[PDB]
Amino acid sequence: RGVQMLLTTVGAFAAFSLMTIAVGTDYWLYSRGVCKEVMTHSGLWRTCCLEGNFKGLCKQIDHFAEYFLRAVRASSIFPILSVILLFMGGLCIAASEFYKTRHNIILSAGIFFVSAGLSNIIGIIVYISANAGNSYSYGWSFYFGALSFIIAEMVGVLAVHMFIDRHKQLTG
Amino acid sequence: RGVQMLLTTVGAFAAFSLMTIAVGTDYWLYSRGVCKEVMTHSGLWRTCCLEGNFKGLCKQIDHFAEYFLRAVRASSIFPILSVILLFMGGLCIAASEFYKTRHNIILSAGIFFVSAGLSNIIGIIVYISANAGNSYSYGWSFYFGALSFIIAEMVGVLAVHMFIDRHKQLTG
Amino acid sequence: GISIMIKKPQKSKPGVFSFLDPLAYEIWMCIVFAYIGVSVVLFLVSRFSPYSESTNEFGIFNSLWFSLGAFMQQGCDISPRSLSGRIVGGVWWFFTLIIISSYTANLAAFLTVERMVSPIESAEDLSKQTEIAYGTLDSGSTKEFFRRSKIAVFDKMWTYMRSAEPSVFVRTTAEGVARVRKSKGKYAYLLESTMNEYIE
Amino acid sequence: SESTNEFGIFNSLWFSLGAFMQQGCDISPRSLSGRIVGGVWWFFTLIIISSYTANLAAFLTVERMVSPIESAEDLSKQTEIAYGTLDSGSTKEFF
Amino acid sequence: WFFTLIIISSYTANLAAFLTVERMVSPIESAEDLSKQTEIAYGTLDSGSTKEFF
Amino acid sequence: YDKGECGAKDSGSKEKTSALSLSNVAGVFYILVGGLGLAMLVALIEFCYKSRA
Amino acid sequence: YDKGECGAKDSGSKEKTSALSLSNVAGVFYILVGGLGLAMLVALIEFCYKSR
Numbered sequence: 001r002g003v004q005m006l007l008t009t010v011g012a013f014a015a016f017s018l019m020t021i022a023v024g025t026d027y028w029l030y031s032r033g034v035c036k037e038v039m040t041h042s043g044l045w046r047t048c049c050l051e052g053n054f055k056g057l058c059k060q061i062d063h064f065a066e067y068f069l070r071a072v073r074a075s076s077i078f079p080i081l082s083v084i085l086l087f088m089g090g091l092c093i094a095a096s097e098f099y100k101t102r103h104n105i106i107l108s109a110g111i112f113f114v115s116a117g118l119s120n121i122i123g124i125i126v127y128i129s130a131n132a133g134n135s136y137s138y139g140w141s142f143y144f145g146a147l148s149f150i151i152a153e154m155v156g157v158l159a160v161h162m163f164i165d166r167h168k169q170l171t172g
Numbered sequence: 173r174g175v176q177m178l179l180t181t182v183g184a185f186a187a188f189s190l191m192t193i194a195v196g197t198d199y200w201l202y203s204r205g206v207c208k209e210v211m212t213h214s215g216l217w218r219t220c221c222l223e224g225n226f227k228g229l230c231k232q233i234d235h236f237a238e239y240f241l242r243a244v245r246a247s248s249i250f251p252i253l254s255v256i257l258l259f260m261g262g263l264c265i266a267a268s269e270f271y272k273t274r275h276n277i278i279l280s281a282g283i284f285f286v287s288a289g290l291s292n293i294i295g296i297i298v299y300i301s302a303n304a305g306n307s308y309s310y311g312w313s314f315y316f317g318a319l320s321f322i323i324a325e326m327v328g329v330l331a332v333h334m335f336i337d338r339h340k341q342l343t344g
Numbered sequence: 345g346i347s348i349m350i351k352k353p354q355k356s357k358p359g360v361f362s363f364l365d366p367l368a369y370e371i372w373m374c375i376v377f378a379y380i381g382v383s384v385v386l387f388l389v390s391r392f393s394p395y396s397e398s399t400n401e402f403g404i405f406n407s408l409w410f411s412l413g414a415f416m417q418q419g420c421d422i423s424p425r426s427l428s429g430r431i432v433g434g435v436w437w438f439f440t441l442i443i444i445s446s447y448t449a450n451l452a453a454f455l456t457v458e459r460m461v462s463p464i465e466s467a468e469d470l471s472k473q474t475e476i477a478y479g480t481l482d483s484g485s486t487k488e489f490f491r492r493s494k495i496a497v498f499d500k501m502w503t504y505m506r507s508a509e510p511s512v513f514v515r516t517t518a519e520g521v522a523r524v525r526k527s528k529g530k531y532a533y534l535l536e537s538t539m540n541e542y543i544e
Numbered sequence: 545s546e547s548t549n550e551f552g553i554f555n556s557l558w559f560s561l562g563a564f565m566q567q568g569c570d571i572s573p574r575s576l577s578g579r580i581v582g583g584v585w586w587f588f589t590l591i592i593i594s595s596y597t598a599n600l601a602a603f604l605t606v607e608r609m610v611s612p613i614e615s616a617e618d619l620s621k622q623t624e625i626a627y628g629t630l631d632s633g634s635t636k637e638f639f
Numbered sequence: 640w641f642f643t644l645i646i647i648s649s650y651t652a653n654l655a656a657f658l659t660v661e662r663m664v665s666p667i668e669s670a671e672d673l674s675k676q677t678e679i680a681y682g683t684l685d686s687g688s689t690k691e692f693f
Numbered sequence: 694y695d696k697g698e699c700g701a702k703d704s705g706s707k708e709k710t711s712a713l714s715l716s717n718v719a720g721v722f723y724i725l726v727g728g729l730g731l732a733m734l735v736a737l738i739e740f741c742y743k744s745r746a
Numbered sequence: 747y748d749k750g751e752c753g754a755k756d757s758g759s760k761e762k763t764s765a766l767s768l769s770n771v772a773g774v775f776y777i778l779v780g781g782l783g784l785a786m787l788v789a790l791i792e793f794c795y796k797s798r
């Protein structure tokens with residue numbers, strides 16, 4: 001009842017913040033490794049060594065038919081796509097304060113959120129398929145990404161619910 | 173007509189009697205052992221010897237993550253709780269001779285009977301699991317428990333049906 | 345009589361959730377995301393206007409309820425009306441059809457391998473097995489027996505005892521037993537059967 | 545207003561039986577607690593069936609007769625199988 | 640329903656076992672098996688110096 | 694004979710024979726029971742809603 | 747021949763199976779996601795067809 005605007009306006013910014021933070025941190029994975037083995041932490045882009053004298057030493061990640069798949073991991077384009085699309089989705093509801101009675105600025109919001117979620121899913125699957133090729137375990141960023149995906153889904157669902165409600169009452 | 177009140181109270185009484193007998197008899201299992209090898213019979217609390225010079229001797233059972241599961245077998249809490257809740261249910265419907273016009277007694281006793289029944293499945297699963305932690309064959313108390321469970325599952329349906337009928341007649 | 349001695353094989357205690365072991369953690373995780381996404385997309389496409397949204401039952405909760413019925417292969421009460429929804433349904437059906445089959449196949453294989461273990465029996469194939477090592481006491485009569493007997497299998501036993509290093513020999517029964525106890529599975533020892541019958 | 549739905553006790557037993565067997569059950573819980581109850585039951589039956597079929601498949605692949613006895617202790621616990629030494633054999637005198 | 644559940648399962652299990660047994664056919668190779676295999680038989684020409692060599 | 698103090702061996706019946714033990718699938722029953730236990734509270738909150746309409 | 751060591755030729759020790767990796771089935775997930783992606787587009791083209 002009307003108030004649903006107050007809720008759906010919340011989560012999108014949070015999901016954006018969580019996802020961009022997750023992209024921006026070197027703690028997706030714990031593993032043996034090196035920074036020129038010792039226990040190691042890594043993000044998408046780079047590796048930094050701990051648990052030894054070199055602690056704090058870093059290097060950029062090793063970037064290196066199915067061959068053409070490698071580009072997908074190397075780029076990590078999918079996170080970035082999801083972030084940009086989520087930004088666009090938020091700008092949809094930011095726009096819909098103006099140009100009222102159109103009702104159709106809202107529509108695209110859910111589509112952006114859905115597509116961003118599907119991208120995030122693909123990104124995770126790719127990352128696992130690449131890296132699994134040693135008593136590893138996942139760093140908090142990974143779960144941040146999962147939660148971000150979930151909340152993006154929920155916000156999309158309730159935004160579509162709003163466009164269902166607000167437009168119908170005009171149609172009798 | 174009506175007398176189903178008598179039938180349900182009889183059923184509850186009989187289930188309670190069977191359950192307390194089962195908890196109170198050394199007839200859960202036959203196995204080989206010694207009341208510190210000979211045929212030996214076990215209650216849930218105590219190990220007692222037959223078929224030899226020590227016939228009629230008894231000793232306290234040897235009780236000694238799954239680290240925490242150990243205490244669950246030792247306490248046998250689910251049997252006790254099942255008995256307590258069946259007692260609660262039976263005593264509730266016994267009060268229905270007075271304090272009428274509220275009908276909450278019957279529904280509450282129904283829920284008590286159902287929850288009491290569920291408790292015994294857990295108890296059985298726990299016991300059968302822990303004892304594996306040969307040649308064994310079950311004593312009569314196990315079947316007194318099974319029968320108690322079956323009667324508890326029977327009586328509650330009839331009690332809920334009675335509540336429904338005695339309430340629905342307000343529709344006519 | 346002379347005897348061989350070994351550690352007990354450790355008993356294969358089941359886990360509380362051992363049934364998941366065929367399928368690995370990551371798949372179990374990713375199923376959840378696939379379920380959620382599928383349900384949400386089915387809802388969204390179902391309830392966008394057909395040109396009027398009152399024309400179908402596929403509300404959010406019903407959309408979540410349909411998909412769970414499909415994964416466990418127990419049918420359903422309702423079926424999607426439009427082409428797009430039918431596409432989604434077919435896709436999800438193919439996915440579950442692959443997964444369930446793979447799970448069953450793997451579990452069968454896992455049990456099957458366990459049967460044909462064929463553990464060491466009669467211990468005479470210690471003349472033929474080589475992954476498992478075996479020791480003998482220093483200066484023992486046993487140390488003379490294998491040089492002094494010349495039956496072919498005991499010849500190759502003595503050849504092994506000659507060539508293998510760190511050596512098969514040991515100074516004491518106590519520390520030989522300690523070696524067997526620590527070197528579980530991979531190591532064995534030769535001793536008088538009377539002494540084993542005392543120990544075991 | 546009560547009994548506005550199919551789920552009498554008889555029909556409930558029927559539904560749960562059809563649900564175990566993986567067979568067409570027409571009625572639907574339509575309601576949250578019922579749907580919850582429905583879910584886990586399907587999960588249970590799926591796991592049980594898969595286990596049974598896998599294990600039987602393994603069972604038919606390799607066979608092992610199992611010897612009935614192994615020890616003189618078993619020969620002391622003998623059910624029916626009679627036994628004895630050679631006659632006139634000094635093992636008899638030894639016994 | 641119970642009848643169906645038993646039959647179909649048994650069929651699937653049996654077919655899997657049947658295909659599995661064939662995979663371990665492991666045919667004779669390298670003449671090394673003839674050190675141990677005795678279901679097979681083998682022999683030579685007579686009066687051939689193969690016999691003297693052997 | 695006094696000094697021997699371990700004799701536990703499979704007798705009367707045997708663990709190793711063929712069949713799956715209850716323990717081998719034990720976990721599933723706990724999930725089931727918890728599932729059935731949860732659905733009660735949903736109906737109870739549904740009652741608590743309607744009972745003051 | 748006295749220096750023969752590698753009886754592992756005969757598989758003198760038996761491997762044990764492990765769970766399927768995500769890689770061993772990963773293919774199917776792509777098919778699913780592609781199907782959903784296609785599925786969204788039909789609805790928009792349908793709505794534009796019925797826009798007049």
Ligand SMILES: N[C@@H](CCC(=O)O)C(=O)O
Pocket residue numbers: 629630632633634635636
């Ligand atoms: N060989 C034995 C006879 C067989 C037996 O004792 O059973 C003897 O010299 O008397």
